[PDB]
């Protein structure tokens, strides 16, 4: 949604998501709404910065 409203300055996307479709679009989305994104390793790693187990996005 934050991307849908152009409000995101930068998005990060875990490359490991089991329902791969959960994410697939985000690149196409961030492209369409002019957000710079970067598919980054570990849904694990995003978890640690945000205090969850996983995180999928950030």
């Amino acid at each position: 949604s934050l991307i849908e409203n152009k409000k995101a300055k930068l998005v990060l996307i875990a490359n490991d998501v089991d329902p791969i479709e959960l994410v697939i679009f985000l690149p196409a989305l961030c492209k369409k709404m002019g957000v710079p994104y970067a598919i980054v390793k570990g849904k694990a790693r995003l978890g640690t910065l945000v205090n969850q187990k996983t995180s999928a996005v950030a």
Partner: protein
């Protein structure tokens, strides 16, 4: 909103990306058990529309069923009787494959209460169904009034009676003119209209 994408993605099913993710998954499940526990629902949207919630007591169980018709068992094709019912082969079990999946996991996971199910994949051999199940024993459910209903005793094996969604279709329970012969219930309306009703004064 992530869901409306996934919602409207999944509908593109012969799509280059989905066909890949299909063929890859129909391997994962082919190699796993026939009724094995899905750690999380692989159509999280589809799930959560069908009353899945990501909270304790809710579960998802994948399950596999054989595609194709029912064979009338009868030794050797010896049906015995009016050639009408010599039919062994092209014969079609009236409960869906969806339901049979819900039912098979029901008896496996007796403590759980099926809530709904949804289609994942299929192939030659099998349809695959993600079945969402819920634990009326468990408290998170029993307290919170949104789910609490499912804990009542009149939802013990909703799948078996055909109180699941698939069940109610297969029972032929819509409103309207296209569904007279079953509406309250097939064996009901019959047993209402195949009754002689006699008053005191006739």
């Amino acid at each position: 909103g992530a869901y409306k994408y996934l919602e409207e993605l999944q509908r593109k099913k012969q799509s280059d990306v989905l066909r890949f993710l299909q063929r890859v998954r129909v391997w994962e499940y082919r190699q796993k058990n026939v009724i094995h526990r899905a750690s999380r629902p692989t159509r999280p949207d589809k799930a959560r529309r069908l009353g899945y919630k990501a909270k304790q007591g809710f579960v998802i169980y994948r399950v596999r069923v054989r595609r194709g018709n029912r064979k009338r068992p009868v030794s050797k094709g010896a049906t015995y009787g009016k050639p009408t019912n010599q039919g062994v082969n092209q014969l079609k079990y009236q409960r869906s494959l969806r339901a049979t999946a819900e039912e098979r996991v029901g008896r496996r996971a007796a403590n759980l209460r099926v809530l709904n199910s949804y289609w994942i994949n299929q192939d030659s051999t099998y349809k695959y169904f993600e079945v969402i199940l819920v634990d009326p024993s468990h408290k998170a459910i029993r307290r919170d009034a949104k789910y609490n209903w499912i804990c009542n005793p009149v939802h013990k094996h909703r799948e078996a009676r055909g109180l699941t969604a698939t069940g109610k279709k297969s029972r032929g329970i819509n409103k309207g003119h296209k569904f007279h012969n079953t509406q309250a219930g097939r064996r009901k309306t019959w047993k209402r209209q195949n009754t002689l009703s006699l008053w005191r004064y006739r």
